[PDB]
């Protein structure tokens, strides 16, 4: 077919220009991808009238007697619009430029990092315990292995008793650990944005103390971005990350002043190269000795987190997290929003979602009657659960869940009203975690990174490109993440190009 031959020899021309020299016969997948893209993008660029002429040209119908190749105006759109754009995507360094929070990723070793100064965060939820022994052994082992360097731990003394405070200070002097009290930082000596983060973290820990929705993992999320806690150059790690066998040089360099942990998952696409989905995480964050460039990134991260704390209702409306969409449409949330008039603390919301899982009537009224029936019985109980919510029949609804425990033969959950609380609390985790992760945690933080590589065709792992650094993900992997730049590893996200 004439049109086929043109698309094929056009494909082959493009392949030879974007593929490593000598490796064109290893790029059969890219060849299939270029051909497929040339065809789709051309049709997507033609008018209906031009699409109808091509159909007649391929069939050899209409003004045509035999199957013909493209009309010249079709060939121009192909050669001048379609082919040059696909070339740019495969082969142009400009297409690989990544700009995060107003700063380019250098393809150079532009920013220095101290790999030996490490810090973690532990905010205790029990004023008598300053740190669980399980966590203590992790830090102790990490501190000894991070020698000769420094190992710091961020804590909050207002969350501990005098006994716990003295014993933490004592444990640390004995274990080469510097302790950083966030309640001991003069916020007037500190940047406006650092002041905001620290205040926000204290309020979270304060609401935790009063059991009014606060959360220590959220406070840990905040303080990692605080400039004064980061100091001259440091790497945040989660307290449970293993140290590597061989350490990397005490100084390393990369092309961005803030290195998150990153990877990608590959799904095979058959004859065509694999789709690649990047994963971003804050279990490991390296910060540069360049403090002016780092200030630009961490303040941007902070301002955006603060934006979400200041407009909870708006961001929950706008989230595409499906657990937040379930929450957004629950009767409980709608009543919660009309009572607060849309103006509420994130902590107030968490507290409300926590109280929903306290008894059956709460759970029934908050997440609806239809859900209750489907979770613990069938649709047919709907009219009865609706009238039970409306008359606050606590006992009925406990009985129905108790009935669910025996029918589905749930022997880790007693039929005591306490056993119901246990069962409800096991469900809370899935509607509660996004009220930490989507505001202060990795998904919220990673927004800036995801935006930076957005508005494009779905990334792919093109094995044999002449110019890898035209692909944003390849720029990210080599110049914008901790991979190769830290003495720690993690299972929390895939490795790069993990199958």
XYZ file of N, CA, C and O in Angstrom, residues 339-447:
436
model
N -22.154 22.898 58.934
C -22.083 23.371 60.311
C -20.946 24.376 60.497
O -21.143 25.444 61.086
N -19.749 24.048 60.001
C -18.602 24.956 59.936
C -18.657 26.017 58.839
O -17.749 26.855 58.786
N -19.654 25.998 57.953
C -19.770 26.973 56.863
C -18.596 26.885 55.885
O -18.184 27.894 55.305
N -18.059 25.685 55.677
C -16.860 25.489 54.881
C -15.539 25.976 55.447
O -14.530 25.912 54.738
N -15.491 26.450 56.692
C -14.269 27.010 57.280
C -13.846 26.103 58.433
O -14.446 26.147 59.511
N -12.811 25.289 58.226
C -12.418 24.374 59.288
C -10.930 24.047 59.238
O -10.292 24.096 58.183
N -10.394 23.736 60.420
C -9.085 23.115 60.557
C -9.069 21.752 59.877
O -10.076 21.040 59.840
N -7.906 21.386 59.326
C -7.688 19.993 58.952
C -7.839 19.074 60.161
O -8.319 17.942 60.031
N -7.433 19.549 61.343
C -7.518 18.736 62.553
C -8.965 18.505 62.963
O -9.329 17.397 63.375
N -9.792 19.554 62.905
C -11.218 19.391 63.167
C -11.816 18.318 62.270
O -12.610 17.486 62.724
N -11.440 18.316 60.990
C -11.953 17.310 60.067
C -11.501 15.912 60.471
O -12.319 14.989 60.566
N -10.193 15.730 60.684
C -9.673 14.451 61.160
C -10.427 13.980 62.398
O -10.843 12.818 62.484
N -10.599 14.875 63.376
C -11.336 14.530 64.587
C -12.745 14.041 64.261
O -13.231 13.079 64.867
N -13.418 14.701 63.314
C -14.758 14.274 62.923
C -14.731 12.893 62.280
O -15.560 12.033 62.597
N -13.782 12.665 61.369
C -13.657 11.356 60.736
C -13.270 10.298 61.761
O -13.651 9.127 61.634
N -12.529 10.686 62.801
C -12.203 9.746 63.868
C -13.435 9.396 64.697
O -13.661 8.222 65.013
N -14.243 10.399 65.051
C -15.431 10.147 65.860
C -16.467 9.317 65.111
O -17.285 8.639 65.742
N -16.463 9.371 63.776
C -17.382 8.551 62.994
C -17.172 7.060 63.233
O -18.129 6.283 63.149
N -15.943 6.640 63.528
C -15.621 5.228 63.690
C -15.711 4.773 65.146
O -15.164 3.720 65.494
N -16.394 5.541 65.994
C -16.508 5.246 67.417
C -17.663 4.305 67.728
O -17.533 3.435 68.589
N -18.809 4.474 67.076
C -19.924 3.567 67.296
C -20.699 3.406 65.997
O -20.479 4.129 65.022
N -21.605 2.422 65.989
C -22.347 2.102 64.773
C -23.182 3.285 64.297
O -23.208 3.591 63.099
N -23.879 3.957 65.218
C -24.735 5.078 64.840
C -23.928 6.187 64.174
O -24.340 6.740 63.147
N -22.784 6.540 64.762
C -21.864 7.472 64.120
C -21.505 7.003 62.715
O -21.673 7.738 61.735
N -21.005 5.769 62.604
C -20.577 5.246 61.311
C -21.729 5.230 60.316
O -21.545 5.555 59.137
N -22.923 4.839 60.770
C -24.083 4.814 59.887
C -24.461 6.219 59.433
O -24.701 6.457 58.243
N -24.520 7.167 60.370
C -24.947 8.521 60.028
C -23.915 9.250 59.178
O -24.286 10.062 58.321
N -22.626 8.985 59.398
C -21.585 9.727 58.694
C -21.415 9.251 57.256
O -21.408 10.064 56.325
N -21.278 7.942 57.049
C -21.025 7.401 55.720
C -22.290 6.960 55.007
O -22.209 6.447 53.888
N -23.436 7.169 55.614
C -24.705 6.935 54.966
C -25.326 5.618 55.376
O -24.641 4.642 55.699
N -26.611 5.469 55.035
C -27.352 4.209 55.296
C -27.101 3.172 54.201
O -26.974 1.990 54.536
N -27.051 3.608 52.946
C -26.820 2.697 51.801
C -25.502 1.961 51.998
O -25.478 0.750 51.781
N -24.456 2.674 52.405
C -23.122 2.057 52.574
C -23.220 1.064 53.716
O -22.883 -0.079 53.496
N -23.665 1.509 54.882
C -23.881 0.622 56.029
C -24.519 -0.709 55.628
O -23.996 -1.781 55.954
N -25.666 -0.661 54.936
C -26.331 -1.888 54.504
C -25.406 -2.753 53.660
O -25.299 -3.963 53.879
N -24.715 -2.144 52.694
C -23.881 -2.923 51.786
C -22.638 -3.459 52.485
O -22.097 -4.493 52.078
N -22.168 -2.770 53.529
C -20.969 -3.203 54.240
C -21.258 -4.323 55.230
O -20.424 -5.216 55.414
N -22.423 -4.298 55.877
C -22.718 -5.211 56.971
C -23.888 -6.139 56.698
O -24.091 -7.089 57.462
N -24.665 -5.894 55.647
C -25.782 -6.761 55.299
C -25.990 -6.746 53.792
O -25.050 -6.988 53.029
N -27.211 -6.460 53.348
C -27.507 -6.267 51.938
C -28.363 -5.021 51.759
O -28.799 -4.387 52.718
N -28.570 -4.678 50.486
C -29.465 -3.587 50.131
C -30.827 -3.705 50.821
O -31.466 -2.700 51.116
N -31.322 -4.907 51.069
C -32.698 -4.932 51.565
C -32.898 -4.279 52.945
O -34.036 -3.929 53.271
N -31.836 -4.056 53.735
C -31.949 -3.463 55.077
C -32.031 -1.947 55.070
O -32.319 -1.341 56.120
N -31.799 -1.377 53.865
C -31.754 0.075 53.630
C -32.881 0.841 54.317
O -32.584 1.707 55.152
N -34.157 0.540 54.088
C -35.228 1.310 54.736
C -35.162 1.274 56.242
O -35.575 2.236 56.905
N -34.646 0.185 56.798
C -34.587 0.031 58.241
C -33.400 0.785 58.821
O -33.501 1.386 59.895
N -32.267 0.789 58.116
C -31.114 1.556 58.580
C -31.383 3.050 58.462
O -30.931 3.840 59.302
N -32.134 3.462 57.441
C -32.481 4.871 57.297
C -33.364 5.338 58.446
O -33.147 6.421 59.004
N -34.363 4.535 58.818
C -35.206 4.888 59.954
C -34.471 4.725 61.277
O -34.876 5.330 62.275
N -33.402 3.927 61.310
C -32.631 3.758 62.537
C -31.674 4.925 62.760
O -31.490 5.368 63.897
N -31.061 5.425 61.684
C -30.283 6.658 61.761
C -31.167 7.822 62.202
O -30.757 8.647 63.036
N -32.411 7.879 61.683
C -33.350 8.988 61.905
C -33.937 9.023 63.299
O -34.451 10.081 63.702
N -33.912 7.911 63.997
C -34.372 7.758 65.367
C -33.209 7.497 66.331
O -33.433 7.306 67.526
N -31.971 7.598 65.828
C -30.734 7.352 66.563
C -30.759 5.992 67.269
O -30.328 5.869 68.417
N -31.243 4.952 66.581
C -31.278 3.603 67.158
C -29.861 3.027 67.190
O -29.442 2.265 66.316
N -29.112 3.407 68.230
C -27.763 2.882 68.429
C -27.740 1.356 68.537
O -26.868 0.701 67.953
N -28.682 0.771 69.283
C -28.631 -0.662 69.562
C -28.894 -1.488 68.307
O -28.213 -2.492 68.064
N -29.868 -1.063 67.493
C -30.196 -1.759 66.252
C -28.949 -1.925 65.405
O -28.633 -3.018 64.916
N -28.218 -0.820 65.243
C -27.119 -0.750 64.300
C -25.925 -1.517 64.816
O -25.172 -2.097 64.028
N -25.725 -1.508 66.133
C -24.730 -2.386 66.727
C -25.108 -3.844 66.504
O -24.266 -4.667 66.130
N -26.382 -4.179 66.733
C -26.854 -5.540 66.495
C -26.631 -5.972 65.049
O -26.268 -7.126 64.790
N -26.860 -5.069 64.091
C -26.693 -5.434 62.687
C -25.230 -5.736 62.384
O -24.919 -6.671 61.635
N -24.308 -4.968 62.970
C -22.891 -5.236 62.740
C -22.481 -6.515 63.457
O -21.746 -7.342 62.906
N -22.912 -6.677 64.712
C -22.750 -7.952 65.400
C -23.235 -9.107 64.527
O -22.556 -10.132 64.396
N -24.414 -8.948 63.914
C -24.931 -9.953 62.987
C -23.978 -10.191 61.828
O -23.867 -11.316 61.329
N -23.291 -9.140 61.383
C -22.331 -9.271 60.295
C -21.109 -10.060 60.739
O -20.598 -10.901 59.987
N -20.732 -9.911 62.009
C -19.516 -10.591 62.550
C -19.696 -12.107 62.506
O -18.729 -12.795 62.192
N -20.900 -12.601 62.787
C -21.137 -14.068 62.844
C -21.319 -14.625 61.442
O -20.716 -15.656 61.134
N -22.152 -13.967 60.647
C -22.419 -14.418 59.262
C -21.105 -14.582 58.487
O -20.975 -15.599 57.801
N -20.174 -13.627 58.577
C -18.938 -13.690 57.820
C -17.812 -14.146 58.736
O -16.638 -14.186 58.355
N -18.165 -14.520 59.943
C -17.428 -15.492 60.703
C -16.042 -14.867 61.048
O -14.964 -15.422 60.867
N -16.162 -13.622 61.583
C -15.067 -12.688 61.898
C -14.638 -12.855 63.357
O -15.098 -12.136 64.263
N -13.727 -13.778 63.576
C -13.339 -14.196 64.911
C -12.198 -13.389 65.520
O -11.792 -13.684 66.647
N -11.667 -12.387 64.823
C -10.797 -11.414 65.474
C -11.568 -10.245 66.074
O -10.946 -9.327 66.618
N -12.893 -10.256 65.990
C -13.721 -9.133 66.426
C -14.872 -9.605 67.304
O -15.824 -10.224 66.787
N -14.819 -9.370 68.614
C -15.914 -9.794 69.498
C -17.197 -9.003 69.278
O -17.189 -7.870 68.798
N -18.322 -9.620 69.651
C -19.618 -8.948 69.562
C -19.870 -7.971 70.689
O -21.019 -7.545 70.869
N -18.867 -7.652 71.488
C -19.035 -6.580 72.447
C -19.113 -5.248 71.697
O -18.544 -5.106 70.612
N -19.857 -4.272 72.227
C -19.742 -2.906 71.695
C -18.303 -2.420 71.558
O -18.033 -1.573 70.696
N -17.373 -2.922 72.376
C -15.963 -2.603 72.160
C -15.429 -3.289 70.909
O -14.689 -2.676 70.127
N -15.787 -4.564 70.706
C -15.369 -5.263 69.500
C -15.854 -4.583 68.238
O -15.218 -4.690 67.185
N -16.986 -3.884 68.324
C -17.466 -3.098 67.195
C -16.542 -1.910 66.956
O -16.161 -1.616 65.816
N -16.179 -1.202 68.031
C -15.221 -0.107 67.925
C -13.920 -0.566 67.280
O -13.352 0.138 66.435
N -13.432 -1.747 67.670
C -12.242 -2.311 67.045
C -12.445 -2.489 65.546
O -11.596 -2.091 64.739
N -13.574 -3.086 65.158
C -13.834 -3.345 63.746
C -13.962 -2.049 62.958
O -13.412 -1.928 61.858
N -14.697 -1.073 63.497
C -14.802 0.224 62.838
C -13.439 0.900 62.705
O -13.127 1.480 61.659
N -12.610 0.835 63.754
C -11.297 1.476 63.707
C -10.393 0.865 62.642
O -9.508 1.554 62.125
N -10.603 -0.401 62.282
C -9.791 -0.987 61.223
C -10.128 -0.375 59.869
O -9.281 -0.349 58.970
N -11.358 0.113 59.709
C -11.782 0.790 58.487
C -11.294 2.234 58.401
O -11.118 2.755 57.294
N -11.093 2.895 59.546
C -10.745 4.319 59.564
C -9.470 4.627 58.785
O -9.366 5.687 58.154
N -8.493 3.722 58.818
C -7.206 3.984 58.186
C -7.299 4.436 56.740
O -6.545 5.312 56.302
N -8.232 3.861 55.980
C -8.313 4.159 54.554
C -8.949 5.509 54.235
O -8.647 6.087 53.184
N -9.775 6.064 55.123
C -10.329 7.400 54.907
C -9.554 8.467 55.669
O -9.706 9.663 55.375
N -8.669 8.069 56.576
C -7.893 8.989 57.395
C -6.551 9.351 56.762
O -6.164 10.525 56.762
N -5.832 8.362 56.233
C -4.497 8.606 55.691
C -4.440 9.705 54.635
O -3.502 10.518 54.692
N -5.356 9.794 53.661
C -5.300 10.929 52.721
C -5.433 12.285 53.393
O -4.954 13.280 52.836
N -6.042 12.364 54.575
C -6.067 13.617 55.316
C -4.725 13.936 55.963
O -4.615 14.945 56.666
N -3.718 13.097 55.751
C -2.329 13.423 56.037
C -1.507 13.481 54.754
O -0.744 14.423 54.533
N -1.672 12.481 53.883
C -0.810 12.370 52.711
C -1.123 13.445 51.672
O -0.208 13.981 51.035
N -2.401 13.783 51.484
C -2.753 14.743 50.441
C -2.546 16.191 50.866
O -2.683 17.086 50.026
N -2.213 16.445 52.131
C -1.989 17.798 52.625
C -0.525 18.090 52.909
O 0.008 19.093 52.428
N 0.146 17.242 53.684
C 1.529 17.473 54.065
C 2.475 16.370 53.615
O 3.694 16.546 53.725
N 1.955 15.255 53.098
C 2.762 14.102 52.785
C 3.244 14.034 51.348
O 3.116 14.988 50.572
N 3.814 12.880 50.976
C 4.474 12.761 49.659
C 3.634 13.159 48.451
O 4.142 13.866 47.575
N 2.373 12.722 48.365
C 1.570 13.068 47.192
C 1.378 14.576 47.090
O 1.472 15.147 45.997
N 1.070 15.230 48.213
C 0.936 16.684 48.209
C 2.243 17.351 47.801
O 2.255 18.251 46.952
N 3.357 16.932 48.409
C 4.653 17.524 48.086
C 5.003 17.270 46.626
O 5.438 18.176 45.906
N 4.811 16.030 46.168
C 5.232 15.650 44.824
C 4.471 16.393 43.732
O 4.883 16.337 42.570
N 3.354 17.047 44.071
C 2.601 17.839 43.100
C 3.513 18.710 42.242
O 3.448 18.666 41.009
